[PDB]
From Swiss-Prot, chains A, B, C:
Coiled coil regions in record: none
Species this chain originates from: Homo sapiens
Boundaries of the shown chain within the full protein: 36 to 532 of 839
Lumenal side: 50-81, 351-359
UniProt name for this protein: Autophagy-related protein 9A
Physiological role: Phospholipid scramblase involved in autophagy by mediating autophagosomal membrane expansion. Cycles between the preautophagosomal structure/phagophore assembly site (PAS) and the cytoplasmic vesicle pool and supplies membrane for the growing autophagosome. Lipid scramblase activity plays a key role in preautophagosomal structure/phagophore assembly by distributing the phospholipids that arrive through ATG2 (ATG2A or ATG2B) from the cytoplasmic to the luminal leaflet of the bilayer, thereby driving autophagosomal membrane expansion.
An example Gene Ontology CC term for this record: intracellular membrane-bounded organelle
């Protein structure tokens, strides 16, 4: 039944994604819960805005919650009489309906892959979370004569399945590393800033690869017109017009995307401001660092393995760089906040009728939050500074470092060059909130002029590997600093 | 004064236990506090049930606590008029009185050992917590001509004191490792389950060793009738009748034991559900793992040393096994709980009169507990998976591993075989609560049929070591998987 | 402009202190904030004592905070009518004014050093927090012909700048290590106790070095009269009179210093009793251990580097010493506290009207604090005891250990000898609170009799190093136990 599927790219992508998302049933439940998350966010925001009154809740017998909830008829009438909200409601509803249709289609598309796993591979769906991709790939390449997927080419190879899965990720890595994309700017106040978000990456990929009129004809061969040099200026102008149209669309959807981002961030990151307020001072590998430390023909889990093995030294290194003014401010703010909080707590203990005072409880809560977040920037008074033996054990994992880092690891030049590869979680959240605003700007003013050189790139950096199609060249550039398998 | 004590087993057991429980005064205070714990639990439960009224406490001038407490006369009358409670009260009172009598007797029994330490050993009672059992045993064997405990045999030896202390623990280890005890079952829903609790072990030991009519005549020689083969069926039938009677007694005491277990668990494990709600997700060496990883002639602290040195790798290993469905459920439950909790907290901060609403405070508390327990099952996003180099450093400590573990450490066959040696703290608590119920069942239906083979064992697996008595054979079986000193 | 400054001691001290306190602006802001801390403490205590009434706050419409605050006119009248408070107010005001004058003077004194850094060294004030003292000292010694600070001697050397910076710290180390200072006592109840506080060290230094009539003439040469032996008894009697006068002054200022210490400790250590109540069970290197493990000619950061590298093993070692009675008391107190707290929490959850009871909330808070501080003394049930391989890795860092420590590290003789070098944070706080009381006593009865031998020391333990002046002898004594570079 798996003879000449003729979409081996998407087939292998799905075969790999079903192994990553452990099990067909677990993937199904994950997508069900993600649909439920969106539905819950939208419904709960609508409820809070319309039904609840906040007049008899803020107190201006005990007041019970069903007192504040208006009856369903008048709440629905108030929803209807809004308009400005009823527009966003239909927009979100049609988006959710489209998502549900896609999920219904993918259900069968992935049940096919489940059957392929069960029969052609003899791998039970209970032994997937305890099997490795090396074994799955070895079985696929061993049984390649029985299930008979690709005998058009002579045989199937691990290099062929790699090229099939990572065909567009190799192109994105080559672009980002050859600096053919507008992701660096000079900001008065900070200077050099690398701005690379999920929205920007999605837009770049949608402009270049996906779509009916993109650079790639079907899914494994870019249109022949892009392999010649005569029509260079035509191709550049066409790409510029496409980029302009997509940037205009991004600007049109800006309020919707911004509202969704704000709501999701407040729902998914505001309980941490009490449960663990120091969790936003930590760091994570930036979306630029992921595309910068990535080899050619390297799977997502193979990259995450290194980015996990090299995380604790990368936190120790970035903690060995004390900020003096920040430490001073933290110490003094903590002292003042704790000195007020101790008096409040002693008064409350001696007599609790002081909790009924108008603002004492909220004051105490906010002062506790303040002292707990200020105590998070004070480094431990006893930590060993060895910033040279830390890079030697980071470079052993991330495999890529600029040449001017091994000699001088203590300078304030490496720390801010490395901070683009290892950014604050709060900076990630911030630059994700600013994305719906500043994504069209980069997609109109900063990407459209470059539209020429990109089309030069795709013309002279594409190899026709037999049995696979058009892939990106690896050994041609080799101008990534270190280089390592 | 220590000439021919004639109970060297119990004497050496006490000499070792006084070294373990550091100091005579510390052991005395420990037993005083354990008596006080039992008294407090019983008295506090009786108080909460009888005196307090909960009508004028639940509010249906400020209400003060002495308002709820009924006067002593009417509370005592209400205690008296119960009956169903006054029976449990006399039962608990006579149990506590018996315990106090035993403690009074042991006071003098251990002051004798304190004097033996002070005089015959020249070890002050202030240098015990800083002395090792190797030194204590060396001193005992060196001064064995002055204090003159055992010159009936030619000399005293460390092997002799080992055999004297661990005479019954060697038998229990041999039984559990030769599978002559009913501790494994097939449960529809889980499959193979190892059920071994303190109640079961105590009952096994009370059936076999302790008692007037048990297998052992005095304390170091089993009755001669058990060394012959003629009366095999008589001995088996007698053992079966004894097991039946003791299992019937266990079933008769079931409600008392169950009530005590419930009360003690609620008193000693319910503050952790707020103080550290993730502490029940941790793991501990099961009572089966203790008897499985135990050598022959190995003291309790010598076993605990290994079980402590091999605890961190044994936690890392069992954490390297992700549960996909559990992680999905945890992530989604945490998202929903935190999204509701953030709205509640923001409302409370903006205006605190919303805390007077009927259910807001208990809602907030339960939602915080929910999000904090759900966040405990989400593994850290950055952890290295190396499940082969972890068994190599566990086996170096626990010294015992089945043969079919070194080859395949990532399978879902080893993880659930190892989870019988390293169980959840919550599973320990659960199977301890079910013990008063399901202990007689195993003691009537599952142990009574085996009563034949046990008596075969004791007949052909007992060695008469001169100067010590009847001990268990070590080199006869040697069918524990790895083997190591 | 830096030709023959003629106060090279203070000049180099300031050059080093500006490198340590990272940057001129950061040092300025630190001193501003320390002045503000003192002002805030004093003003807030005065406010709490005078303005607030606590009658309409303790409740004997909602009560708002501006209701409790008396109007400024009557609060100022109440401040004026006190007297006993208005005296302390003028004392604190003149102290703060003197501190502000000193700060104004030091502003210019350190702007001079900032200019010296910028011009004579070519080290920008933005590259200081990322430069090392080795590089700063190398630059100072390299450019020593251009800026022309000291060509009176032949050349400048790193040994010369070391001797210039640490001239008095070497003397203090020699005294403390030769036991010419009264810092050890026999206390009935504890026995040998080492009492060394910041007040005692400041008084010792003010008696010996600083001042107009101290032992040192200007700043690098002790008066010639102290280099002869004829006037020994005169010099001893003069030193005794000076010590007596300074001890009398210390006793006169005792209530002021004690009030300040109490207020500062309550303001800076009472929020930790809720934020992290186990933080006072930790340990820190005592002020005696600092002067005991210190080499000759070793800077403060060079000492702190070792005391930081040898902190985790020094905590593991002092945790490998179990206190049996303390562990028993902790376990039992935690059990009882948690058993009461669980009942209170279950009642609150089932019905929240029980929070309005007169003492339930403060009871719950104090019981939570009790159980959380008791749970802090219970050691982790799984920790490896290897107290011999810990001293081998501590001595590698602290470089100094008595001879009778390597053989027997498990005894209860080393643990209490090492506990004078590594003390509880709470013991530090306590012995700092008792300092204003017991500092004059040691300065009248215990230091005044020794005044003879000290003057012997300074007479026969001073070397005239050319180009530097009078320094302390190093190789003369060499009776510190281990010895290491």
């Amino acid at each position: 039944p798996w003879h000449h599927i003729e979409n081996l790219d998407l087939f292998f992508s799905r075969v790999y994604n079903l192994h990553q998302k452990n099990g067909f049933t677990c993937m199904l439940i994950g997508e069900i819960f993600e649909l439920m998350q969106f539905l819950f966010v939208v419904a709960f925001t609508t409820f809070l805005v319309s039904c609840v009154d906040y007049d008899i809740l803020f107190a201006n017998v005990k007041v019970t919650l069903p007192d504040a909830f208006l009856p369903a008829q008048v709440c629905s009438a108030r929803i209807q009489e809004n308009g400005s909200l009823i527009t966003i409601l239909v927009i979100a509803g049609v988006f959710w309906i489209h998502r549900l249709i896609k999920f219904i289609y993918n259900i069968c598309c992935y049940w096919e892959i489940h059957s392929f796993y069960l029969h052609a591979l003899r791998i039970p769906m209970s032994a997937l979370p305890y099997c490795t991709w090396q074994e799955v790939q070895a079985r696929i390449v061993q049984t390649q004569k029985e299930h008979q997927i690709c005998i058009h080419k002579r045989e199937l190879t691990e290099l062929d399945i790699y090229h099939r899965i990572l065909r567009f990720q190799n192109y994105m890595v080559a672009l980002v590393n050859k600096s053919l994309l507008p992701l660096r700017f000079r900001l008065p106040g900070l200077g050099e800033a690398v701005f690379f978000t999920r929205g920007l990456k999605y837009n770049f990929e949608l402009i270049l690869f996906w779509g009916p009129g993109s650079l790639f004809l079907n899914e494994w061969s870019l249109k022949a017109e892009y392999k010649r040099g005569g029509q260079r200026l035509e191709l550049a102008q066409r790409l510029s017009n496409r980029i302009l149209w997509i940037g205009i669309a991004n600007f049109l959807l800006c309020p919707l995307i911004l509202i969704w981002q704000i709501l999701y961030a407040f729902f998914s990151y505001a309980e941490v401001l009490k449960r663990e307020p120091g969790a936003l001072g930590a760091r994570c590998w930036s979306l630029y660092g992921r595309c910068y430390l990535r080899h050619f023909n390297e799977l997502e889990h193979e990259l995450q393995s290194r980015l996990n093995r090299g995380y604790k030294p990368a936190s120790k290194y970035m903690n060995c760089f004390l900020s003096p003014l920040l430490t001073l401010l933290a110490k003094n703010g903590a002292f003042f906040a704790g000195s007020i909080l101790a008096v409040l707590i002693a008064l409350t203990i001696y007599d609790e009728d002081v909790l009924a005072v108008e603002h004492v409880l909220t004051t105490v809560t906010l002062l506790g939050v303040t002292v707990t977040v200020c105590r998070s920037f004070i480094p431990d008074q006893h930590m060993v500074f060895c910033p040279e033996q830390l890079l030697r054990v980071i470079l052993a994992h991330i495999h890529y470092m600029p040449d001017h880092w091994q000699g001088n690891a203590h300078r304030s030049q490496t720390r801010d060059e490395f901070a683009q590869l290892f950014q604050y979680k709060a900076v990630f959240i911030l630059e994700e909130l600013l994305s719906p605003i500043v994504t069209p700007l980069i997609l109109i003013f900063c990407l459209r002029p470059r539209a020429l050189e990109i089309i030069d790139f795709f013309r002279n950096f594409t190899v026709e590997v037999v049995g696979v199609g058009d892939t990106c060249s690896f050994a041609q550039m080799d101008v990534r600093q270190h280089g390592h398998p």
